[model samples]
Target: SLFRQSFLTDTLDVHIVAPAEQVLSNGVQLKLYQRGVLEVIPENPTQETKNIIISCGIHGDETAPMELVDSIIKDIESGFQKVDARCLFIIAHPESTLAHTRFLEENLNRLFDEKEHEPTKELAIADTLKLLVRDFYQDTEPKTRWHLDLHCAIRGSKHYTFAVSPKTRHPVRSKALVDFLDSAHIEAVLLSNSPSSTFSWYSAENYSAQALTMELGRVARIGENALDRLTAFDLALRNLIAEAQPEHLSKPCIKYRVSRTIVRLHDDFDFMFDDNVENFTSFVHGEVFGHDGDKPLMAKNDNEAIVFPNRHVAIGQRAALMVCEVKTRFEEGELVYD
Candidate 1:
């Protein structure tokens, strides 16, 4: 509790100074010694119990999730929140958080893949995150493992709160994962078709965990975020901590699958869409969206939507992603569109 007591004195705004170690009255082991890291373990683990990782600030400048998770932590330490399952909470890329920037060099979320490359600070942090997650799940046979890497979008979206699920060799995601999103008041889900360097994808691909890169809302300054906007999500997360689930959603969730990824290939790359266009903006087949040099970027689907469109990205980076609706649930060994 000493750290928590003197938290205001810390010069750097990078640490969550909380109880160094505490055995909760309910027999949950709580540790928050490491900077911006918190570990909670149930005294007796079981197959039905889950190992969960909730992460935020991987992009540093995405502040809503950071603030949301910070409030949860403060509540947990103050005995306002309940804990029933083991969880690891990490405010990843703490350096970027203090600097109030997305990243110093390479995007931290892009440093997850295993490859021989030049070492950078972001790469080292990615390695550290991997080790931390591996250690957290070591020798545990929990029935489920979940990782939610939260962020806020740079632009507004039709579905204000949505999740980007990773592509997996085993594409069939657990129904509970969807239920969790529904409980959190998620408006849509975008399922990926290819692997990437995203932290969520890394955990899902390597650890067989159900992972989601969630975008809650538009970006804002750290403390300036209207945390009340996340009330439903906050409540749902609390329910998850108590080994409970949220009530049934009132509306069906909209679903999407990756249709195309637009890359900024060369110096002449150009996006034909307006810079202020909202995500999920629709277009019909044969509509030219942009051009990469002399090649045209046209919609292939009869009806498609654009998400994460960015015209100012550097060459060799993704300018946007196009998606098409998935009207039916995707089940194991089958693509059911009914």
Candidate 2:
């Protein structure tokens, strides 16, 4: 009944039941792997069948992405969208989701590091997710792989929809994924300069998948999200599942690269800006944007922008990221930015 009823409703109510595999009328095989994990396989596949993993709710309070993914699954079941790709859907951190909180113990987003050991519930969930992804990748033959971890930001942004592409073994991002993001009306792409302990980064580094952490909009309650604003994104995801080419965007997508990461080393960490300061807010040189204990954090470049600025993160974690625009080009099969 979980599959028949609204996935979000069932999930939030903690009414989960995993039945045996079932086939849709359209001949798509659906399997409920766990409470928040589902896999859809097409009846007929090709060598080019893309293996896609779309995950959301890592931070449970971010509900828009989870709703979007649930809608996609419903459409697939109703034959509104054709599925040519093998897809895995994950509502990560079900406990946090049910509790209507960002996280219970640790930040689930930051606990993806397998090397680090912690006894938190989030860490246990992270380990389970990693194992699921590992098996998902290893069980299948070589094919194009993609991991899109959807989320909503805690603050407003200049670009409402954007993606953070993690640094991986292959630093250069896939052109196809960028095109998809453009079609999804994502206005900007931020390239991480270093590896991170994010879900997308884990997939990219270990499986060599074209992975991205997509931030759709500002955080909203379950029913308060402006779903109309994300029509382009919804359509683009459906098209991607159908293995169809994406449409062109009205404006070109802007590209940015992480220039600096501000870490909170002491308990006395705070941002110089007001709590309402929007993301991608540019700061001029010599302006102190934050303070880490006795040290003042200033802009290194004139137009550098601050993103994901948070003063409440655990010490020794990233408090903010500074980024700057870049002109990228391919030179000798390598991506060069200037």
Candidate 3:
């Protein structure tokens, strides 16, 4: 949670000055990393290598990101990796996090394109850290590394993860980066090229590195597998840092298909609201779920199966909740990621 002082109203919150602390299931303690950037400079780091970071909570409402960060802290403190990569981290929205607002100022992710960011109570925390951490990143070329910004769902629903717009139906061959995501039963629907003001996408695209904005399930309304999900992403994060190329990576093949696409042609925005059920819940065929604000929402899945609705304004969402049942084949080639 963020420090509860007034940020927009002339007072500064506490997470700004320094990060807070979080307790983990493991005895090892983790830091909230309030605002400042952190670097885990190895005692014997590769003289010439990259810095990989797993950041979370850039959006105040996104809880999975913070949870992901917490997992990493425990991993580090527990003496897990004696590996050879540098790691950087920070919890972006310490204050809004506590307030449960999406952002403090404008979404801080948008702050990157500005000439000079204006400070608000929210901005004040990141601003102070920017001044403090700018020196660490000054001589650094932005593209020499990778970043993973863990994120969670917004409104409420089932858990689903999407990469930035650049995502295809295929996972990257590198298991370290892609395998764990697959293991978690998450798919990267969008690519880094996807449109969004995500910090990872912004930093990676500009810096010549393969960056990813990894979205997780709902933060507030999480499922029972919270710890498992957190561990999966955290482990993936560390694996990315330790090695760029997974030794025995899966040869990736791309695929595509959409359960349903929202188009202006149909404008089918009804049949959602009355469906008073969480995502991934099973439904019988031909079931009349409910009305969207006014339209009727029905089931299209077969027999007794689970349906994961990708609702917008809700986690794992979009008004068109696709119970996907289609697949397509594509050519095999290395993804010439831009």
Candidate 4:
């Protein structure tokens, strides 16, 4: 009921009468950790049970992921979906979500680092989330951990559904995570080459969780999302909640590694390409893709593609990423990219 009445209705002030803890019809223990945060614990969790963090609304305007998360909550409550793992479901920024904005002050996605101490509305929320995740993984009982921070891109992408695997402290890639992505029909995966302040990156680097920042589709207002395009992902997510291994589609994902970062350095910085250019749009070697002040940003490699291009980012913020395709494989328990 919280999903429909308060969260979906944007009525953050409404008093929810539900108890803090409840037993679902299927006997799963559901605990309300706080507003916008809920934990689902199976009655008989074992060492193999996954400690999963499914977070949404970090960038409040990304409504598709939020909507999908709402559906999962509703299904689990209604006994249509079973919870087999320990799950922490978070609607990370409800205030911003109700206001229909990405954030109230600073970008929430960039404030996930534990070392970030600047006082801001988003930073406070990130601090709370980080503490929750830290405790979730530090429990005495050992279990496989995962963090899936779902989002929607600000612009269209060549691959509609793709994921970003954070650069973890260790170099080993989880084979299970790769299989999960394949099962979700994720078309591409960017293997991040450097550390980031992203939620997924925090979990990967600190907690050693197999974390992914999943960009399911382009941004859309609430109720305007083309959810039909995400049927494969939806099914896979349900299977994961039920603790069933989703059958991999076997279509390998295109792997990419960031070659360079384009940072906005001046007020006059802008991309040379048309505004309609999509993510992963390839450029010829020596071609100018954008200009910052008087410096032209040129492609150094043939077929170098761009991702997350945004001319409106604040100065010193990442404006785009120049990426190149790579062959990634697990070899002797290490992730090798070439």
Strongest candidate by TM-score = 2
Q: How far out, in Å, is residue 38 in model 1?
A: 0.7
- Residue 251: error of model 4 in Å? 0.6
lDDT of 2 by residue, 258-326 (tens): 888888999998987899889899999989877889988899989799988889888897888999999
lDDT of 1 by residue, 177-253 (tens): 77787788888888887787889998889887788999988778867887888888878888887787556755656
Deviation in Å, model 2, residue 99 alpha carbon: 1.6
lDDT of 3 by residue, 128-227 (tens): 5344344334556544455666676543444455554333233332323445445434554332222333455445444433456666766672223366
Clash-forming residue pairs, model 2: none
How many clashing pairs does model 2 include?
0
RMSD to truth, every model: 2.9, 2.1, 8.6, 2.4
Candidate lDDT (C-alpha), each: 0.78, 0.83, 0.48, 0.82
Alpha-carbon runs more than 4 Å astray in model 2: 1-4, 139-143, 265-267, 331-336
TM-score of 3: 0.57
Candidate with the larger lDDT of 2 and 3? 2
Task: State every prediction's TM-score relative to the real structure.
Answer: 0.90, 0.93, 0.57, 0.91
Please provide, for model 4 over 1-338, each residue's C-alpha lDDT reduced to its tens digit, 9 standing for 90 to 100.
43445344432444552537878767888877677788888878888898889998889888887788778877888788888988988888888877888899988889876564679999888889889898788873322888899998877778999999888666426787787788889999998887889998988888888889999997788789999998888888888878886665478788899989888888999887888888899999999878999988999999689998888898998899999999777886555697
Decoy 1 TM-score against native: 0.90
Model 3 residue runs over 4 Å out of place are: 1-36, 110-143, 155-159, 165-185, 192-195, 221-225, 244-338
What number of backbone clashes does candidate 1 have, counting pairs of residues 3 or more apart or in separate chains?
0
**Model 4 ranges with Cα > 4 A deviation:** 1-14, 17-19, 114-117, 140-143, 264-268, 314-316
Best by lDDT: 2
